[PDB]
């Protein structure tokens, strides 16, 4: 487990490693916005 003082952020930590995947998906929202130019 995380050290006691940081236990408040445990649910945040359970989610962090997915974040790089969101950058790939974000690239397609950006291209959707400008119409795949």
């Amino acid at each position: 487990k995380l050290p006691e003082a940081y236990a408040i952020f445990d649910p945040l930590v359970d989610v962090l490693p997915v974040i790089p995947v969101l950058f790939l998906a974000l690239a397609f929202v950006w291209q959707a916005a400008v119409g795949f130019r």
Binding site: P11, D14, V18, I19, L22
Partner: peptide, 27 residues
């Protein structure tokens, strides 16, 4: 919840696109 955090985090990305599109940014 864990789903509260990942919702806020997930909302951030598209929100950047929206702010820039609504302000005619360098998209």
């Amino acid at each position: 919840a864990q789903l509260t955090m990942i919702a806020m985090i997930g909302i951030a990305g598209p929100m950047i696109i929206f702010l820039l599109a609504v302000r005619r940014g360098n998209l």
